[PDB]
Structure formats: C-alpha cells, structure tokens
Amino acid sequence: GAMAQNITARIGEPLVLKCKGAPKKPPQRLEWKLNTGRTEAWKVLSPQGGGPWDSVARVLPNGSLFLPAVGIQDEGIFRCQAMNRNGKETKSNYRVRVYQIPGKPEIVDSASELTAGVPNKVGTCVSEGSYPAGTLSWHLDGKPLVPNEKGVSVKEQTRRHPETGLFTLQSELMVTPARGGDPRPTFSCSFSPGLPRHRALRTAPIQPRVWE
Amino acid sequence: GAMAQNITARIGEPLVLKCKGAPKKPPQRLEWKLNTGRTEAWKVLSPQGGGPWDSVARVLPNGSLFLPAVGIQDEGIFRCQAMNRNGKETKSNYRVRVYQIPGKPEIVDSASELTAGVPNKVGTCVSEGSYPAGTLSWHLDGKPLVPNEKGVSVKEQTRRHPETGLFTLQSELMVTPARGGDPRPTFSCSFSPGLPRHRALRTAPIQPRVWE
Amino acid sequence: GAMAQNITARIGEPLVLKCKGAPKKPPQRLEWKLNTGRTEAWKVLSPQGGGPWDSVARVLPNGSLFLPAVGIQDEGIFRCQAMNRNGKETKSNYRVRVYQIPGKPEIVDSASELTAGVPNKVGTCVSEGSYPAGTLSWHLDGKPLVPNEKGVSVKEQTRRHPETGLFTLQSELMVTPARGGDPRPTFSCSFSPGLPRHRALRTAPIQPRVWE
Amino acid sequence: GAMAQNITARIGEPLVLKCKGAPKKPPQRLEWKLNTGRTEAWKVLSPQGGGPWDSVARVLPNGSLFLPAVGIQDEGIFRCQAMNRNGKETKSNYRVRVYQIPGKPEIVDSASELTAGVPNKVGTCVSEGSYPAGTLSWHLDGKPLVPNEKGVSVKEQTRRHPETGLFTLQSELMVTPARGGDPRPTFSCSFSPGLPRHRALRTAPIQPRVWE
Ligand SMILES: O=C(O)c1ccc(Oc2cccc(COCc3cccc(-c4c(C(=O)O)[nH]c5ccccc45)c3)c2)cc1
Ligand SMILES: O=C(O)c1ccc(Oc2cccc(COCc3cccc(-c4c(C(=O)O)[nH]c5ccccc45)c3)c2)cc1
Numbered sequence: 001g002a003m004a005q006n007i008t009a010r011i012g013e014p015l016v017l018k019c020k021g022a023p024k025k026p027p028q029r030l031e032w033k034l035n036t037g038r039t040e041a042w043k044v045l046s047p048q049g050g051g052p053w054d055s056v057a058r059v060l061p062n063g064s065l066f067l068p069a070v071g072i073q074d075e076g077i078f079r080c081q082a083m084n085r086n087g088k089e090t091k092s093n094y095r096v097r098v099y100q101i102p103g104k105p106e107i108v109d110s111a112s113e114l115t116a117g118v119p120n121k122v123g124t125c126v127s128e129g130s131y132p133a134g135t136l137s138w139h140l141d142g143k144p145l146v147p148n149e150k151g152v153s154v155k156e157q158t159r160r161h162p163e164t165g166l167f168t169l170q171s172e173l174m175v176t177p178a179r180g181g182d183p184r185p186t187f188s189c190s191f192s193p194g195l196p197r198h199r200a201l202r203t204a205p206i207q208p209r210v211w212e
Numbered sequence: 213g214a215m216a217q218n219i220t221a222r223i224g225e226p227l228v229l230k231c232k233g234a235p236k237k238p239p240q241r242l243e244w245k246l247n248t249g250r251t252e253a254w255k256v257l258s259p260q261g262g263g264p265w266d267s268v269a270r271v272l273p274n275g276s277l278f279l280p281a282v283g284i285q286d287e288g289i290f291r292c293q294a295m296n297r298n299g300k301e302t303k304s305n306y307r308v309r310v311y312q313i314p315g316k317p318e319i320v321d322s323a324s325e326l327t328a329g330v331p332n333k334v335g336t337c338v339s340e341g342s343y344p345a346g347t348l349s350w351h352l353d354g355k356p357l358v359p360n361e362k363g364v365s366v367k368e369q370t371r372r373h374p375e376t377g378l379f380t381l382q383s384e385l386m387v388t389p390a391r392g393g394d395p396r397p398t399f400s401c402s403f404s405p406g407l408p409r410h411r412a413l414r415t416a417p418i419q420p421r422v423w424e
Numbered sequence: 425g426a427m428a429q430n431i432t433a434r435i436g437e438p439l440v441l442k443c444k445g446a447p448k449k450p451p452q453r454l455e456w457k458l459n460t461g462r463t464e465a466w467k468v469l470s471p472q473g474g475g476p477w478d479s480v481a482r483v484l485p486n487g488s489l490f491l492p493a494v495g496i497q498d499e500g501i502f503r504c505q506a507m508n509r510n511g512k513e514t515k516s517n518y519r520v521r522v523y524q525i526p527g528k529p530e531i532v533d534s535a536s537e538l539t540a541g542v543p544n545k546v547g548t549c550v551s552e553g554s555y556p557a558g559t560l561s562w563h564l565d566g567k568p569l570v571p572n573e574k575g576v577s578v579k580e581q582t583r584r585h586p587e588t589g590l591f592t593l594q595s596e597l598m599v600t601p602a603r604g605g606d607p608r609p610t611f612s613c614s615f616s617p618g619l620p621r622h623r624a625l626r627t628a629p630i631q632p633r634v635w636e
Numbered sequence: 637g638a639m640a641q642n643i644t645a646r647i648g649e650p651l652v653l654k655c656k657g658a659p660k661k662p663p664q665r666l667e668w669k670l671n672t673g674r675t676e677a678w679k680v681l682s683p684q685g686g687g688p689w690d691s692v693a694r695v696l697p698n699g700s701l702f703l704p705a706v707g708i709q710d711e712g713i714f715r716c717q718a719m720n721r722n723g724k725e726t727k728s729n730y731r732v733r734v735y736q737i738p739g740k741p742e743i744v745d746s747a748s749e750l751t752a753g754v755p756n757k758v759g760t761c762v763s764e765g766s767y768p769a770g771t772l773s774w775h776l777d778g779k780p781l782v783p784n785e786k787g788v789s790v791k792e793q794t795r796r797h798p799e800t801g802l803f804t805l806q807s808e809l810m811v812t813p814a815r816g817g818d819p820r821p822t823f824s825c826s827f828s829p830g831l832p833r834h835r836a837l838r839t840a841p842i843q844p845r846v847w848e
C-alpha cells in the first residue's frame with residue numbers, strides 16, 4: 001500500500017480521524033474513502049452523508065470522520081482528500097488496526113505437588129477476551145520457560161466467542177523438575193498482546209512443593 | 213473435505229440439523245462439532261449445552277442441532293457422531309451454505325430514445341440484498357445480451373450493506389443499435405443467484421424508440 | 425467498489441488490459457494500480473517497470489498492462505489513469521476474475537442393477553481441475569434430479585490440488601425408483617461452472633436395469 | 637480448536653512431525669489429517685501415499701509426516717491418530733505456524749542535519765523478506781520513540797513480493813528536537829518479528845547534528 005499513519009482503535013470505543021487540509025467548517029470540498037471488513041473494495045463517504053453508513057461512520061462539521069463504536073470489521077484503510085480555500089489538495093492516509101484487552105489471565109487446575117525427575121502437569125493458564133489473539137507464555141522464578149528446551153512442554157488452545165469474535169487462549173504447562181533443584185519454585189503466566197507497545201498482563205504466581 | 217450432505221440455509225431463518233443414529237430422547241451419547249465463520253477450527257457442542265453458544269446453536273431433546281436464526285457466519289461444516297442403544301456409531305456430515313434473496317431488480321435511469329449506429333446508455337439495473345452476491349445480466353427481446361459482442365458494453369459495481377453484509381449490484385448497459393433494426397426494442401435485466409437451482413428474478417422491460 | 429469492466433481471465437493464459445486515453449507510444453503520463461491476491465492493498469506499476477513485478481505484470485509500449493500467464497492470485501482490481509497530449513485525464517477500471525475449465529466429468533462406480541422401492545447407489549460423478557469450484561448435478565432422462573425431493577439423495581465432496589489450487593468435485597447419487605417406473609432409466613451428471621455464461625459439461629449416460 | 641503442540645516452521649526448510657504412539661516401522665495402523673492453506677477442510681494422508689501430495693507431505697517409515705520445504709500455504713493444523721501393537725489409540729495434534737526472517741534492516745535517506753524546534757525528516761527504515769509481516773520501531777539514544785508523543789511522527793508502508801509473498805516494511809520517522817537538547821543524538825530502527833521469542837534485528841545507528 002502507500003505510506004500511512006498507523007491508528008490503533010479499541011473495540012467499542014469511538015474513533016475520530018482528521019481530514020488534513022480541510023476548511024474548518026462547511027462548505028468543504030472533501031471526500032473520504034474507506035476499504036474495511038465492511039466494504040467491497042473502496043466505499044466513498046461525503047459530508048452530506050445519508051443511508052445506513054450514517055450509523056457506522058459519519059463526516060463531522062470539521063471534516064473529520066467519526067465512528068461512534070469501532071468493531072472488528074472496521075479494520076482497514078481510511079483516506080481523505082480535501083481542497084482548502086486556495087485550492088491546494090491535501091491527502092490523509094490511515095491504517096486502522098483494532099484491538100481489545102482481555103481480562104487479567106488466570107491459572108486454573110494448578111498442581112500443589114511436583115515430583116522431581118518425571119513430567120508433571122503444573123497448571124493451565126487462561127486469558128479471555130483479546131483481539132487480536134495474542135499469546136500466553138510461562139515463567140519460572142522470573143525467567144521465561146521455553147517449550148521443548150529443558151524438560152518443558154506446553155500445549156495451547158484458541159477459541160472465539162461466537163458473538164463478539166474475541167479470543168480465549170489456554171496454555172497447559174508440563175515440567176520435569178531437575179533433581180536437586182529449588183523445593184518451592186514459583187511459576188507464572190503472562191498474556192502478550194498482538195499489537196506493538198501494548199503492555200503484558202501477568203497472573204498471580206503459584207508455588208508448588210517439589211519432592212526429591 | 214469428506215462426503216457431506218449439502219444444506220442451504222436462508223439468512224434469518226431457523227435451521228435444524230439431524231443427528232443420525234441418535235436415540236430418540238435423552239440419555240444420548242452424542243457430540244456435535246462445527247467449523248464455521250464463528251469458530252477457530254472445530255468447536256464441540258454437547259447435549260448439556262451452556263454458555264454463549266446456547267444463543268446460537270443448541271442440541272434439542274432428539275439430538276438435532278438447532279440454530280434459531282442463521283447468519284452469514286454460520287456457513288461451514290457441521291458434524292455429529294452418536295452411539296445408539298446397541299453401541300453402533302453413526303456419523304452425520306453437513307456442509308451449510310447460507311443465502312439471501314434480494315428484492316426484485318429494478319431498472320433506473322433508462323433511456324427513452326436511442327440513436328442507431330452510435331453508443332447509447334440504455335439503463336442501469338440494480339439489485340439489493342443478496343447473499344452470495346449473484347450476478348446481473350441483460351436481455352434484448354428475449355435473448356441474452358453478451359458483453360463485448362455486437363456493440364454491447366457493460367459496466368458493473370458491487371457494494372455491501374455495512375451492517376448486514378448483503379450485496380447490492382449495479383449494471384450499466386450501453387448498446388450501439390444496428391442500422392435498420394427494430395425501432396422499438398425491448399430490454400430487460402435479470403438477477404441470477406449464486407447457489408444452484410435458485411430461480412432468477414427479472415425486471416420489468418423497457419422499450420425505447422430507436423432513431424435511424 | 426466503483427463501476428468497472430468485468431474481465432474473465434483463464435488461468436495460465438496471457439492477459440492484456442488497455443489503458444484508455446493513453447498516447448499510442450512513449451512518452452506517456454500514465455500509471456497502473458492493482459489490488460490482487462499478490463498485493464498488500466494497492467501496488468503502483470509504471471511504464472519504466474523494474475523489479476520482481478516485471479515477471480508478473482509489465483506495461484507495454486502502448487500503455488496496456490500485460491500478464492504473460494494469469495494465476496489465481498491475479499484476481500482483483502486493475503486501474504489505469506492516463507493523460508493524453510491535450511492533458512485530458514482518462515480512467516480505466518477492471519475487475520479481473522480468474523477461471524479454469526475442468527476435464528470432462530466422469531461417472532465412476534455406477535450400478536448396473538437397481539431395485540425399485542428401496543434406496544440404491546447409482547454412481548459417483550467426478551470433475552477434476554476447475555476454478556472457481558463450480559457444482560455437479562444429476563439428471564434422469566433429461567430432467568434435473570432434485571436432492572431430497574422424491575427419493576433422491578446426494579452427497580458431495582470438494583478437494584483441492586495441493587500445488588495448483590484447482591478443485592476436484594465428487595457427487596454420489598442415491599435413488600429409490602418408484603414401483604412401476606421405467607425399466608431402463610438414463611442418468612447423467614453435469615458440471616456447471618461458477619462464472620456467468622460459461623458452458624456446462626456433461627457425462628456420458630448410464631442406463632442400469634431396474635427390478636420390480 | 638483443541639489443545640495442540642505449537643510448531644514454528646521456517647519457510648523453505650523441511651519439517652518432520654512425529655506420529656505419537658505409532659509402531660516403529662511398518663505395518664502401521666495410522667492416519668494423518670491436515671487442514672492448511674492447501675486444503676479444502678481436512679485432507680487425509682496414509683502411509684501408502686500416492687498422487688500429487690507425495691511432492692508436498694509424505695509419511696515416513698516411522699510414521700512421521702515429512703514436508704521437504706515448508707511454504708506459506710502449509711500453515712494450519714496437522715493431526716495423527718495411530719494404534720500400537722496392543723491396540724491402544726494415540727492422537728497427536730499440531731498447530732503449524734510458518735515464518736521467515738528478513739535481512740538486516742537498513743536506514744535510507746537519513747538526514748545529516750536537524751533543526752531544533754521544527755519538524756525534521758530523520759530517515760526511512762526498510763526491512764525486506766519477513767513472514768509474518770512483523771513491525772518496525774525507532775529508538776533515540778537507547779530508548780523507544782513512541783509515535784504521537786513528544787514531537788514524534790511516523791508513517792508506515794507494507795508491500796509483498798509478488799511471487800514469494802514475503803513482506804517489505806518501511807517506516808519514515810519525523811521528530812521535532814526539543815530546544816537545548818543533545819546536539820548529537822543517536823537514532824536506530826529495529827525489526828520485531830511476529831512470532832513469540834524470535835529475536836529483534838537492529839539497524840546501524842545514525843547520528844545527525846542538531847542546530848539550535
Ligand atoms: O466542487 C465540489 O463541490 C467538490 C469537489 C471535490 C470534493 O471532494 C474532493 C476534493 C478534493 C479531491 C477529491 C478527489 O479525491 C478523491 C479521494 C478521496 C479520498 C482518498 C483519495 C486517495 C487516493 C485516490 O483515490 O486516488 N489515493 C490516495 C492516497 C493517499 C491518500 C488519499 C488518497 C482520493 C475529491 C467534494 C466536492
Ligand atoms: O459415555 C458418555 O456419556 C458419552 C460418550 C460419547 C459421547 O459423544 C460421542 C459419541 C460417539 C462418538 C463420539 C466421538 O466422536 C466425536 C465426533 C463428533 C462429531 C463429529 C465427529 C467426526 C469426525 C472426527 O472428529 O474425527 N470425523 C467425521 C466425519 C464425518 C462425520 C463426523 C465426523 C466426531 C462422541 C457423549 C457421551
């Protein structure tokens with residue numbers, strides 16, 4: 001595509017996109033074009049508006065585009081072209097990526113006892129309500145646990161909510177504790193969002209006892 | 213995929229899918245699995261049900277799967293596996309395709325006069341509310357008009373309704389009437405649905421005058 | 425999207441798309457833009473060309489766009505904008521749909537004997553190498569057989585070739601012949617292409633004997 | 637879906653997937669099922685093999701599935717079900733995600749001089765050949781530069797190679813240096829891969845002079 005400003009828009013929240021170079025109030029020679037999950041290729045939106053799109057995305061008096069409650073299908077590309085009073089044309093190009101933050105992750109079915117030297121089910125981490133899916137990972141006394149690297153194995157599952165489309169992730173951790181290791185290790189799980197610079201969420205720790 | 217019974221389901225209407233081989237009433241050893249636009253790969257549904265899926269697809273007392281109002285995202289694959297009283301297992305496999313019938317097509321902006329030997333805009337045919345999109349085509353005195361043959365040109369547009377996802381099609385017809393041809397030709401447009409054996413819908417005819 | 429000329433392009437064959445309004449030979453102020461399965465949104469192509477796109481789609485001396493061998497990923501939208509010597513701008517807008525014709529369909533595993541009044545497997549129809557998938561249907565002495573309508577049942581399967589992406593369809597027909605019906609009925613299967621105005625392909629007939 | 641082992645497979649490299657529980661050498665009662673970009677829903681593969689799938693994914697003597705050179709279309713789900721000599725059934729479930737590492741990112745068109753208190757184009761960062769796309773980000777003397785905070789603006793572009801499908805990313809950085817700040821700042825750009833635990837790649841730094 002072309003060079004664009006990246007926009008991250010939280011699902012359910014409003015979004016205002018500026019039409020650069022447009023006069024401050026009507027009359028305005030401007031046009032918006034959008035290609036999103038709602039459209040077949042480009043759809044043109046005008047200041048006069050009208051029709052079913054008025055419920056979804058409307059041009060404001062200052063020429064900006066307004067979406068009262070972003071959904072997953074609004075992901076896509078949004079462009080404006082405007083002429084100012086002098087006649088200079090100005091383009092605006094946005095790439096809109098949508099997201100939702102899940103609830104704090106939880107560990108369910110955690111083991112209270114582990115036996116050293118054999119595989120043990122440690123627990124299952126669950127995160128509900130993300131978009132995009134994101135990922136879950138495990139930590140042992142503050143360091144990342146890497147699957148298939150040192151007696152660690154992980155299985156993962158993804159589900160979607162049938163109406164909202166948001167993701168539920170589950171991750172089951174198994175470990176073989178090394179003989180002579182720490183008798184009260186501390187495990188946690190973290191949710192890492194898909195989009196850049198979004199913060200991780202962490203579970204409360206679990207601390208089983210390890211039998212030599 | 214595997215061999216399946218093809219199911220066509222109209223958007224907004226209920227759908228009942230039989231679980232072959234299941235006992236007539238509970239208790240029943242059966243399981244449904246579905247992979248549709250709502251799911252991440254296979255989702256399992258059980259007679260006990262529960263959760264947000266109960267609003268979308270529920271197992272009935274006789275083991276059939278019930279969807280009270282099909283939508284576009286229910287397109288996909290639906291399977292049941294059941295054991296009867298004797299313990300014989302029976303599989304059911306369905307491929308569900310969704311559709312909606314548009315309103316009767318209309319001709320807008322029709323020409324009242326055509327000039328023979330030059331290109332003329334005849335009209336624009338519009339169909340609103342189909343799924344899958346389907347196609348529009350033109351006819352002249354009962355015979356198909358083929359684009360790019362014998363002085364015929366057509367341009368087409370597709371749009372989607374931003375909330376329902378249903379398609380609006382437009383088709384603009386241009387013709388160059390042959391000199392010495394019929395002075396009062398009859399044009400019509402037809403909507404052809406995407407799915408097999410669904411009937412076409414036809415516009416009222418238009419009858420311009422042709423000037424030699 | 426916008427109004428476009430519909431283009432149907434056979435997979436593996438070249439495609440030339442005209443840039444309306446461009447000068448006949450260089451120098452030319454024109455630009456092509458395409459959004460297809462190969463692109464992230466719009467890709468711009470220029471008369472000078474260069475790079476990996478030269479292998480796929482190149483501007484010719486007369487300003488037309490040339491694809492030496494269309495593939496499935498070239499489905500999409502192709503646009504040109506040109507200025508003539510006078511400075512008039514002209515736009516060209518194409519919607520390109522790709523297709524391939526399968527081999528003639530065949531009936532395999534046909535029954536030689538049918539018993540009236542009970543269900544019988546009649547045969548399996550197979551079509552290899554279509555795009556888009558298309559559909560198979562059955563006929564009995566020249567009339568369409570409708571699934572689930574009169575002791576007729578059909579099961580269907582779709583597969584894709586792992587390298588070419590082309591579709592193989594299979595359709596298994598079962599019938600319960602009516603008592604006192606024709607002792608030597610004639611069944612056939614037809615392949616119906618997905619795109620408009622493309623011709624159907626038909627199998628050779630089978631003529632089992634029916635036992636009263 | 638169901639619980640699965642996550643597999644990350646580099647494009648162009650072989651992949652071997654174990655069929656847990658299968659006998660060590662033929663004869664073996666096992667079956668693989670896969671649903672990937674190459675398939676229409678589930679495709680079954682058997683030890684005997686045959687056909688065009690042998691070029692893509694083949695069962696080995698020990699029952700493992702072998703792909704000699706993974707591509708983007710092999711992303712998906714791979715499952716085995718086997719019986720051992722005793723008759724115990726074992727399932728294996730894999731979710732295969734594909735990737736490619738781009739070349740080291742580069743800064744092009746870097747500014748040698750910046751003026752404090754006004755916006756300045758700093759440079760354009762380019763990364764070629766990733767899958768999934770990944771993202772680019774900028775740093776100033778070792779700290780992340782956040783777009784739209786403290787006089788920082790970024791624009792981004794994504795393109796795909798027309799034959800390989802791999803992504804090229806570009807990111808253009810603009811900054812307004814604060815008056816009285818460091819006269820010789822150090823900027824760099826980093827590529828962050830899409831998949832978890834893959835390492836970032838960093839450009840060589842640039843050090844323009846800032847004029848008060
Ligand atoms: O006299 C009057 O009453 C009157 C006159 C004009 C008018 O409205 C316009 C005023 C200026 C220009 C345009 C024409 O611009 C369309 C457009 C609208 C969105 C985006 C783009 C666009 C395109 C592209 O589509 O080519 N590429 C891009 C790349 C990056 C960013 C944007 C684009 C173009 C329309 C209204 C009323
Ligand atoms: O004791 C109890 O209380 C109790 C016992 C069992 C039970 O429920 C089942 C009763 C019989 C068998 C199965 C196990 O079948 C799962 C399945 C469910 C849907 C579809 C399929 C399926 C698969 C596949 O997934 O392999 N392939 C197919 C191809 C074509 C058609 C269907 C399939 C399999 C579950 C409930 C309660």
Ligand SMILES: O=C(O)c1ccc(Oc2cccc(COCc3cccc(-c4c(C(=O)O)[nH]c5ccccc45)c3)c2)cc1
Nearest residue numbers: 426452453454455456457503504505506507513515516517
């Ligand atoms: O001086 C020189 O050396 C020199 C000058 C110009 C030049 O090349 C051009 C000559 C005329 C106009 C344009 C600018 O047009 C871009 C474009 C290219 C494809 C398609 C479209 C397009 C858009 C849209 O993108 O807005 N919408 C559409 C709707 C329907 C059909 C097409 C479009 C626009 C570029 C080369 C050299």
Ligand SMILES: O=C(O)c1ccc(Oc2cccc(COCc3cccc(-c4c(C(=O)O)[nH]c5ccccc45)c3)c2)cc1
Nearest residue numbers: 638664665666667668669715716717718719725727728729
């Ligand atoms: O006598 C002989 O010569 C002979 C006998 C059997 C034979 O091969 C099989 C040996 C055991 C079982 C099965 C039947 O299993 C199919 C299957 C194959 C892949 C995956 C799955 C599967 C399903 C599912 O599809 O239901 N769900 C899952 C969830 C997680 C993991 C896997 C699955 C099922 C086939 C070959 C030869």
Ligand SMILES: [Cl-]
Nearest residue numbers: 159160251252
């Ligand atoms: Cl799901």
Ligand SMILES: [Cl-]
Nearest residue numbers: 039040371372
């Ligand atoms: Cl639209």
Ligand SMILES: [Cl-]
Nearest residue numbers: 583584675676
């Ligand atoms: Cl397949």
Ligand SMILES: [Cl-]
Nearest residue numbers: 463464795796
């Ligand atoms: Cl691109």
